[PDB]
Amino acid sequence: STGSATTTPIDSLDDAYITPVQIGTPAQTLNLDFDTGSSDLWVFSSETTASEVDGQTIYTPSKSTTAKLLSGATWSISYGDGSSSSGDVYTDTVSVGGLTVTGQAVESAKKVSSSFTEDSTIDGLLGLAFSTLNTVSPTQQKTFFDNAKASLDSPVFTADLGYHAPGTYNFGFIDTTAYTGSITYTAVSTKQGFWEWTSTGYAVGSGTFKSTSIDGIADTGTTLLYLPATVVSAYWAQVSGAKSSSSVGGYVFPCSATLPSFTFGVGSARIVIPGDYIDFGPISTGSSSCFGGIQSSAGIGINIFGDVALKAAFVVFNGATTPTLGFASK
Numbered sequence: 001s002t003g004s005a006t007t008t009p010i011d012s013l014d015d016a017y018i019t020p021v022q023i024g025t026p027a028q029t030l031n032l033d034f035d036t037g038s039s040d041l042w043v044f045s046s047e048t049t050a051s052e053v054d055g056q057t058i059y060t061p062s063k064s065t066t067a068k069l070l071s072g073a074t075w076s077i078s079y080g081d082g083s084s085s086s087g088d089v090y091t092d093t094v095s096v097g098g099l100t101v102t103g104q105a106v107e108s109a110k111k112v113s114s115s116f117t118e119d120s121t122i123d124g125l126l127g128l129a130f131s132t133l134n135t136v137s138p139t140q141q142k143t144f145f146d147n148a149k150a151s152l153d154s155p156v157f158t159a160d161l162g163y164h165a166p167g168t169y170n171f172g173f174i175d176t177t178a179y180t181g182s183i184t185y186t187a188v189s190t191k192q193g194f195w196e197w198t199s200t201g202y203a204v205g206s207g208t209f210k211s212t213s214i215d216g217i218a219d220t221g222t223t224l225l226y227l228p229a230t231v232v233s234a235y236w237a238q239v240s241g242a243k244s245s246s247s248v249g250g251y252v253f254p255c256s257a258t259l260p261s262f263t264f265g266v267g268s269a270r271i272v273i274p275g276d277y278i279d280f281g282p283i284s285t286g287s288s289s290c291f292g293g294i295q296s297s298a299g300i301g302i303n304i305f306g307d308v309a310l311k312a313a314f315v316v317f318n319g320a321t322t323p324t325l326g327f328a329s330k
């Protein structure tokens, strides 16, 4: 089997991407944030504290003839940005782009933090990291991809995120029309539960490529590119007036600037992030200070190849017995 679904930016900045997902019988369609950095499929629901729902579409398990309470199971997750959610668990039929999994754990939120309440466009998250990170207790649950994998034509999914435009998540096949050149594959460590790999270096603009190993994660659920402070300083040094602002929380730059590109290495191959992808617009409405799309990972404990980086590539998440990642230009 295969599936193919379009993913759409939630706003003009590509802050996140939402993908429609069919849950239950008859189908209830919710727009979920596919997150290769976590491993829980959770949704706003009829159980979510009413004051914490503000415009999201909810899953109502009592209206699904295939929903079953997973008795005794609870979940609670805290994300790197400080957001969180928690609740109980149902199993139900879940379909993405024509690919159906029966008995998928659908984690129903009883509580969500303010950042989720405020994002009326995100009805929940669909985790695509390794199932070892799933938070369901006392019986850990499998991701949608883990449950689908044996049925898929090939045990892979691909992320093709758009810049200020829709893109695609495919399951079970590689669309050879969706990228240019060849796909370069690189090793993955699953020891932390992430799609963790090592980039071979970077360049700023037209500058020379610096060969240096950068361990980080391919994370569709993180907006920006978070890299070591040395690398980030070298980038922003090429932008007149750019500075790290403690009050804003990262590097800012004059909105009048033209940003240089940023290149990252995948083996001997190179992925070029155009400068415009690094512009996240005014820090507040009407400001002439703009927020940068490349930020330091120093306070995080891991480097994160988030959407800023991934949207410059066609990315293969290869879930074979030894997982790997593939990157192609597009």
Ligand SMILES: NCCOc1ccccc1
Binding pocket: 016, 033, 035, 037, 038, 079, 080, 081, 083, 115, 116, 119, 122, 221, 222
């Ligand atoms: N990276 C996992 C958490 O992602 C989000 C997405 C939207 C709001 C808050 C957190």
